[PDB]
Paper text:
The full-length, wild-type SHP2 (FL-WT) contains three domains: a protein tyrosine phosphatase domain (PTP) and two preceding Src homology 2 domains (N-SH2 and C-SH2). The binding of a phosphotyrosine peptide to the opposing face of the N-SH2 domain exposes the catalytic cleft to substrate and activates the system. In diseases caused by SHP2, mutations are often observed at the N-SH2/PTP interface (e.g., E76D/E76K), resulting in constitutively active protein and abnormal cellular proliferation. The recently developed inhibitor, SHP099, allosterically closes the protein and deactivates SHP2 by stabilizing the N-SH2/PTP interaction.
Residue numbers in the entry: 2 to 90, 94 to 156, 160 to 235, 245 to 293, 302 to 313, 324 to 528
Write the structure that this text describes.
Amino acid sequence: TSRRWFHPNITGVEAENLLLTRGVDGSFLARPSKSNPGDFTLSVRRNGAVTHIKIQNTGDYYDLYGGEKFATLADLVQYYMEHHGQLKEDVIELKYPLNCADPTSERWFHGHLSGKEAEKLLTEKGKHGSFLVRESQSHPGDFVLSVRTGDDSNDGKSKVTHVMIRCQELKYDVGGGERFDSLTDLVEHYKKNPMVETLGTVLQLKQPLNTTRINAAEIESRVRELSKQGFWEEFETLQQQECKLLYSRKEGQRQENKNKNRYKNILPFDHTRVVLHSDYINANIIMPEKKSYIATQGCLQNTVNDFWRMVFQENSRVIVMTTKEVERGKSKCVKYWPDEYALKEYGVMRVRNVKESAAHDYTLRELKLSKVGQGNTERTVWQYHFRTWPDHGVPSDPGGVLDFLEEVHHKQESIMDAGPVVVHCSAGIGRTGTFIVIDILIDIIREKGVDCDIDVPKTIQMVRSQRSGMVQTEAQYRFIYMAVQHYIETLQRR
Ligand SMILES: CC1(N)CCN(c2cnc(-c3cccc(Cl)c3Cl)c(N)n2)CC1
């Protein structure tokens, strides 16, 4: 629960020299692979030298070359830090995190801000405990910590306080006392032991100032601002918080459930998993914080029957399939529906394919699900199979996805008693999280209009607290922004 071992702005050479001059045998760090965008590299020191292990994320999961697949870098690191003797060349041990000092991935670091801007933002958007750290324009190389204190203006009950931070010999201080190795160490220190002014005011550092909430109508401008690197800084800052979602996943780790996971390490949270009324399926309920989703994996051969038990149990009437049955040569989902016009039984569940409708970007399958033994349990389940998603990367234009979800939305709305919408791909976190986050953001705009606030990272973080790894890559993070922008332009044209 730390994640100081990730260095977002480090070359392969610098990582080698940091392990050799400030590390020891066992010291490790992770960095984004500059060789290919979207990849990563685990750099470990061993026997007086540096070994680089490749981690690939094409959009579905983190693939540790020579290792196992994970939903987050945090789980990857924790897995091998606790299972000493799994990563091998001769076992290669992860012992000591080489902590990063870069604050460019901290939610509260706004190097650009000035004095007035910091006060204006903290005044207009901030509440009690809202703080931020910026670089001082007065003293080149120093920083300033701004904090708003008071009660939730124009009365004096609240105020803003500026606390200078001096950077001397690679370490930071507030003018006296202890000196910290980085701004993060300084901040985390005063989040526990807040400063106390001479007259009693406690400079509490509750939450960082929110700068990612925007008005939907003004999405076009925020997109341009994030393009000359902004997306990357904002996305890795979201990744920096993944270590705050280390929730219980005991049920998926039982022996009797191990073979129900397409990837043993990608598991559902206990507190949001779908419990079947034998009870286990790798799926989670996603509740936006009326319409909910079930984010789940692609069916294994031995989980098709459980999959339909879930669909029936939850009264789901729509399935969003976002992957071909095979991609890049490897399987991603077992065909769990019968051929057109055919009827087939999956355990106690019975499925008829009434008719298939081919579209440009997807295939629709009108399915009639029922329970064997009782001829009053029949309901129509509409499977929307999106088939035009590239094996590598993301769509170049979001119109296909948006038209796809627009149709999926209206079907769901036309069924009164409908339960959660089932969305799945390979591991059910990458594309599945992308489709679900876009659907959530689009829902808000369609209801409240373009004059509403939306917050992309906050929405992804809220979804990640219900299933780990939702939305996997920066390409998918950027594509979400583009889909929202495209949808906004449609509304403004009509
Ligand atoms: C410029 C900067 N150094 C990087 C971008 N920026 C921010 C701010 N806030 C979030 C955020 C918002 C809601 C939930 C979560 Cl979990 C997060 Cl992390 C974020 N992802 N980036 C500010 C500082």
